[PDB]
Each structure stands twice: as structure tokens, then as C-alpha cells.
Nucleic acid binder design. Sequence first.
RNA 1: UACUGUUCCCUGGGAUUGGCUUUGGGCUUUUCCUGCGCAGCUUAGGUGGAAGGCGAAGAAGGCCCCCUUCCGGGGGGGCCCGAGCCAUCAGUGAGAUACCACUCUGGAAGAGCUAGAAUUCUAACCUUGUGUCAGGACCUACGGGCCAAGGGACAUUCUC
RNA 2: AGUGCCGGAAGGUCAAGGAAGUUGGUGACCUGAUGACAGGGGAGCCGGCGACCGAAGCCCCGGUGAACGGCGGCCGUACGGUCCUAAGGUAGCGAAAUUCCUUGUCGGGUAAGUUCCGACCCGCACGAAAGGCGUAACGAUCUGGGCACUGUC
RNA 3: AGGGCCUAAGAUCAGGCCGAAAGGCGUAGUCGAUGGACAACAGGUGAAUAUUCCUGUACUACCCCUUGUUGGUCCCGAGG
RNA 4: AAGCGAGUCUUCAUAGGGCAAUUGUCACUGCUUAUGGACCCGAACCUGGGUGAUCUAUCCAUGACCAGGAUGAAGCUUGGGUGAAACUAAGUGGAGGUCCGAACCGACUGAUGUUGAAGAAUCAGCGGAUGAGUUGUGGUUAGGGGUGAAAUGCCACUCGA
RNA 5: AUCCCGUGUGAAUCAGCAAGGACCACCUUGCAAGGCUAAAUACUCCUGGGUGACCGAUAGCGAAGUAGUACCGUGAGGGA
RNA 6: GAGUUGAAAAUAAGCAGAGAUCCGGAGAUUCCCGAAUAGGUCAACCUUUCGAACUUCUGCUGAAUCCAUGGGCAGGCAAGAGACAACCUGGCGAACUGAAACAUCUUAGUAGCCAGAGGAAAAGAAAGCAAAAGCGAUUCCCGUAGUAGCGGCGAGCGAA
Lengths: 45, 75
Amino acid sequence: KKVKKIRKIILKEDIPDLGKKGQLLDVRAGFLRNFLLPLGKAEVV
Amino acid sequence: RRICPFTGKKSNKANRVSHSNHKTKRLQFVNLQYKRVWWEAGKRFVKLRLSTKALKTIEKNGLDAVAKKAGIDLR
RNA sequence: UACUGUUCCCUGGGAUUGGCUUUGGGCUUUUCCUGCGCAGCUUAGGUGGAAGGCGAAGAAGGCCCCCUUCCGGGGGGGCCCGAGCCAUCAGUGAGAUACCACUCUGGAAGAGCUAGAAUUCUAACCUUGUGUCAGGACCUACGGGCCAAGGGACAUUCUC
RNA sequence: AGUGCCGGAAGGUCAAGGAAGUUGGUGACCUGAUGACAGGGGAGCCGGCGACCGAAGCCCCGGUGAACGGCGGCCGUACGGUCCUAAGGUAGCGAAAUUCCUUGUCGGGUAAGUUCCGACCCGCACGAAAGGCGUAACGAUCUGGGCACUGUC
RNA sequence: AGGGCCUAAGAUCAGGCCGAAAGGCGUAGUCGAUGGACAACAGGUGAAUAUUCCUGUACUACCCCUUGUUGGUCCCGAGG
RNA sequence: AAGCGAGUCUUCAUAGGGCAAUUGUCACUGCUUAUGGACCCGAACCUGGGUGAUCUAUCCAUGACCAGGAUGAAGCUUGGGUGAAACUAAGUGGAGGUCCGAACCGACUGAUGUUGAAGAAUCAGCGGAUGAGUUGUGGUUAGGGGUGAAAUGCCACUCGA
RNA sequence: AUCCCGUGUGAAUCAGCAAGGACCACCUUGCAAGGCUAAAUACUCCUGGGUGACCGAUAGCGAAGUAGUACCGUGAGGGA
RNA sequence: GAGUUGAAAAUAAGCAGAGAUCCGGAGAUUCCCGAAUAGGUCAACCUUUCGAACUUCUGCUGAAUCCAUGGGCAGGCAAGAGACAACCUGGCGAACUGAAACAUCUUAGUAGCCAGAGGAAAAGAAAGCAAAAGCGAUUCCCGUAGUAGCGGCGAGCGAA
């Protein structure tokens, strides 16, 4: 069956690749939970 | 103990059946895990044993919202 | 090597569970070609709006290269040239991609759509330390915190 | 060869799970003749059927016997003919803790020996690590014979 | 002779991990002699005890006092 | 079955055929039948939960024990003998799952015992007896188990659970 | 169908949601994912009061006597 | 309100009309073991420093990191712990048996163990019944009924 995870990520840090310090782009929850929101580099809408 | 401290979920009884109905009993366990969580205020690791649905609830309602329903906190 | 099951173990789907990157999968639209038993000017699959398109919205023939090639001869970038070429007509079971409506075969560029990959990354996850960190004092005593080292989204664990 | 184990392309077979499509139910809403219900049937909502993708395993292919196991007939004159089989027992040993027929036959041992020793081979049905055959020593081991000894007789 | 000292096999186990419950693992410690560590002998007596009572002669551990040194004590690092 | 009803079902749908066109009820007592152990006594077993390693099987920790007598290994020393090794005569030495044999541990043969002196002994002999040895104390292992130099033997006169 | 659960998904809010034995339509009924609550009901180691077509020492509790005693069993336990 | 100092009953000395012995209600004491609780233990003992051990209450403190948590020291009548015939709630959960064998099924969610609490416990105030007629939280008896049903449509099980 499978389901893709789509989250509503607002940024804070510049981010090496995709960031603006103000994107509204979407990613999987594995980015927010494991990488960013521990470090405090982003937030949820 | 096969108990998620947040959801209160236990393992479940099951007479798991053959094609011929010659039953047994076994436990359908909970999908627990040892995993780090991320506290809002503290901003630390929290090394907990949770279900998979516990993760979903935490990502829904921020840890402290969930963690009030299991009295113990600050590790 | 009786019937029926249970367990150990192996294998896939799903959760834990993230990230870029290139190479050649399937399917959906744009547009463009392609597709020589025999009649034979015709490297034409079936069918059709039905007789002027097109040309000076810079032409016939040609220079040399490109795409295709069952090597019969299609199709085409730029331009010396300079504004013509031509549809029924005669051969066919069919008429001319002169304009254009709808689709089979087999293929060329873009766009979407997902999936299959191999590698690496690291931040989940796993594992190490006679590495360090201390209460009134020890941890070369289990463990705990902190930097770290090695694996690495595999593995472990849950369900099917 | 069979089984086991180990390794190995493509092909077949192949679950859960998806997945393009088919087909049914219900029904706003149009409709149809005398008989009292009947045709459809948009959207939504329900249920079935599934072209394709889908691993291990198994078939399939190779290797392995101090892996489970197995190691032939028939007919003629040491020698040949012919059949079947994966292959037809090599060395050694052989009437044995194996031998049925059986007190096999021959020799030794005794006045006389279905037990004993050596040889023969017609091995019913030994046999090479469920080892084969030998071997000094050792045995409250089995099994024959002698001397000494005695109420065992 | 044992205990008031010490530890082995083993036991129980704070915190810690794991488990329907009961509980299981396991460190710090704590128990646990069959082992280590420690000070007494003869003679005498008496219905029934005696290295125990009696007589003699001993030894271990503490509190006096004479000299003293300024710290002791535990933890702790070694020898043994 | 809808349904119809003194009829109804069967079928073009009749004729025929089936079944109908009627009759108490509540007790007490007995007789049988049913359900519960069910007329009484009697298994081998199965399952759950506990108790046992003072017997015995293995191991662990700590102690203890093995009279007396024999044989004479390796090595070593001194000669003999070599380029040096090798080899060989005497001394020294005290090995050994070595020998004979008490305690100790066993259990081969017989006799005795058989409502025994004894629910495995007595007697006469037998094997080991410095080791894979014996044994005291204190412990460990538990029955869909343990333990087993392996007989299904032992796990408290109980063992194919 | 209704009720509850492991795994994965994952709504709506009274123009709603759920039930009325799959399922859809129309009616009717109710408001799930927060709690509390006497009675009538079950029983007898036991206390008081009453009763018996109950027993009378091989009966009645195992136990009419200082019985769970004597005794047996390592022990659980059995048991006059 | 008259004789007493338990049972078996004997002695010795006492206490009793200024009222004992007795009977009732309320208090005080209660060695040692046992939840056992200062620590140890081979229950009824040994060692002490003489102590409710351990946890949540409550006062201060101050670890590895700021806060915090672990931890240490204090005060505490100090709540909890254990026991308890059946009944009861929750957890785990047999087999013999019946089916003339047996695996679905039955025995049964019974026996057993484990945890918990009361005089009862659990249930309980409709996301409920029922049928176009209505009922109004539970729980228990009569009944519907051995009917509707389920069932190797077998044994059996059996509602509202």
C-alpha cells in the first residue's frame, strides 16, 4: 500500500543546499525529526 | 515489559490459526523501540522506549502535551 | 519419505527510516518521422474533410554535411540561385504526407508521472574505549553524562 | 544414478502486497403497457473479477563418498560371447562372535574329540575408518590342551 | 570451641537492565569455614564438671603513671 | 414459503393423489427416558501447581588420607671413542595412569542365608591400592527437567519420565 | 452486523456523526472516543435468636479425652 | 449486692458491708519472634553508634552541565506495607472427559496459580431498545423457550 510523508517545513539556518532562511518547501519527517529540529535549524507550520 | 508508557498499549492474545483450525496461542507484541526523542524546552536527547504510534502522537502534539498523561518526566 | 501443527532458521511487503546525485526502466501529452510480396515515376498501414494548396509569411534545380537505410532511394541544416512547384490524368485490391480529420505499426527531442539501481553522505539506528567527567570518596567495578572511533538507513526489533 | 550437503547463469513455477482496466448493487432524473410494478439510470457510496510488476524455495546446472549409502546376471571353451547397471568388490581375510545345509572335507592333538588348532573356499549372507588385516604387552575376559595337586569321582 | 575479625565455593543484591503477575540477570556492598587471624600449662579435688573450680607458675587485650612528639583517625598508594 | 382456509398442497390446469375435516387440563403416586459422580467398588494414565541433590549422577570451594616392601627411566658424572657428534662400561638418580601388599575404596567366584542376624548381609577367598585415586565439611544443577567414561542407568528402598 | 484488540493507514462536527444483523437509499432512534453513584443480588472462618419425620460414639466435623495431637515422612504432605 | 483468691481443689496467707469476687462500657501496660523495619542471622538469638528500614509527603541543600534530575543531611505519629473462610474484580490458563476412535468442536474460559478490594463486588445513567405503535440508567427472579438460531448442521451449544 505505502504512503509518502509530506511535512510543512519553514526554515531558519541558510542550509547547505535548498534553503533561503525562509522557504515553504516540503520534505519527509526524517529531515525534521533526525537532522534539523534537534539542531534547531527549522520549525513546523 | 512490553508496554508503551504513553499509549498504554500491551501485547494482544491470538489463537493464530492453521488452514485446518488447529489453534495455538501467541502474543501479537507492540512495535516498541529504544529511541531518542527531542524535548522542546531542554532541547536534549531523551532516551525512551516508545511505540510507533507514540512517535505519531509526539509529532502530532509536542512531547509535553503527551508526557503529562504519563506523570513521570525529567527522566 | 503417517496426518496435522508448533518452534529454530531463511525470504519478501509494511513501521523504525533520512539525503543528494548519474544511467536506462515502464506509462501519460506535445510534436516529428517511420513503416520497399505484386502493379511499378511510388523505402505506400487502414481510412477520410473533398479538389486548390503553396509561392515573393524571399522559390525550381543544386553545394557539402547531417538523420534513416530490408542500400531501393527517402528526409533535411544553411545558402550561391531567385519566386516556382503542380491534384484528378495512365498503371493498383487503395490514392497521392497539394491542405487536413482520425488512428495501427515503430521510433526521435522536450514535459510530467512514478519505479529500479550503484555509490557515498550522516543525522536515526547498532557497536567500541587501562578517552575523559565527578557526591564527603571510588568506576582498570556494572552502569550514567560528555567529546570521540567504526559501521550505517543496511542491520536489529514489531507486524503481515 | 537416488538421498544429503555445498555452490550456480537464463528459463519455468511462485505469497503477501500493489496495480491499467472490466462487471454488479443502490439511486436523483427521464420513461412504459395493462395490472399493480418495470426499463433504464448522472454524481456519490458500496462490494466483487484482475493485463502487468513480485523474493526465497522448488524444478533446472555443476561439485562432493574417513557425506547417508551401494559394490551384478546368463551362456560357452585360466579364456571368450551377451545382457543390465550409477558401479559391479581392489588389497586383505575366510566354514569366522559371521556357515543355514553342517558333526563340511582334509591334516594335528586324544585309546576314542558335534568343542579345539592349521589348511582348503561350495563367502546361504566378510571386506577396507558402522575401518581391513596383523601385533609385544596387559585381562576377577572368552575358549582348547598339559604338568603338579587333591574326597570332584 | 564457636560468635563480637577476615574472606572462597556459593548465596542475597541498593541504584541499573529485562519480564502478563510470580519474578529473571547483575555491579557496589552484605552474608557464608571446611581455610586465614588471634592469649595457659602442670599438679590437686570430687556421687555426677574440670586446659572451666583449687595451688603454683604463665601469657593476650585494655585504664593509671615517667619520658616524651605535635597533630591524630580514617579513607588511601605499596610491602607482606 | 407468500398465502389460502374446512379445506389446502401437488399443475398448462384439470381429472387424479397426499395431508387434513378436530379436543380436555392441573396435581399426587409409581414405571421408564434424559442431564448431573447417577447402582457400588476398582485402573494404567493425562494435565496444572508445588516439594526434594542428608541417598545417588557431575561439578565447585576448602581440608584430610594412602603401613611396609620391590623394580630401577630420563638426565648427570667418570672412563672407553670421535675433527666434534654418534656410540658404549661403570657409578649416581628415584621416574612410572610400574610391581607385591595392609588401611582405604570396590564387588569376580563359591558356600551360607531365603516367615534371614541383614528389604543385598556373613564367611572363605578376589581387583585397584600415587592416581582418570579415596574421603570429611559447605555448596551447585530439578522433572515437557537435571545428570550420565552411556545401562534408559541415577535423581531420598519410587524412574522409558 | 454489533463490541474489543496488534500491525499499517487515517475522517467529519450537529447542511454533522453512529445505530437499526452485509450493503445503498429513505425514515426512526440516539449522541462514542472524561469521570462518579445507594438499592434489590452473591456467600459463611464467624455473633446473637429460633427450628429439625437430623446424628448419637464404626454415626455426627478428621477431632464428645489437653487433635491436626500420637505417629510416619528430608520435604511438600499424610494422619489415627 | 455475698462471699471470694481461673480448670482440675489440697494446703499456706490474704481480701471482703467504709461494699470486694463478679458482670458491662472506656482507658493503661503488652518480654522475644513474625509485614519486622538499627545491622546480621540457622524464627523466637547475636551485635550495636539504641535507630519505623524502605519508599510519596516537607525543610534545606547541591553531582557529572546553566536550570533540572540523581544524591546527601534533617524533621516527622508516619499515609503505605502484612493477614483474612467463602463470595467478588482483573491477569494467565490446563487436561482427563464427551463426540461411542479423533484433529474442528466439547470439557471451559472451568480447575488451578497470580494480583486486587469490599461488605458486598461489578455493572450503571443511552452514540440504547423497538417498529411506524411505543419504551426510557443499571442489577436480580418468573417468563418467553429449550422457541429463534449456531453446529465435522455431528456430539452438542442456545439467545433476546
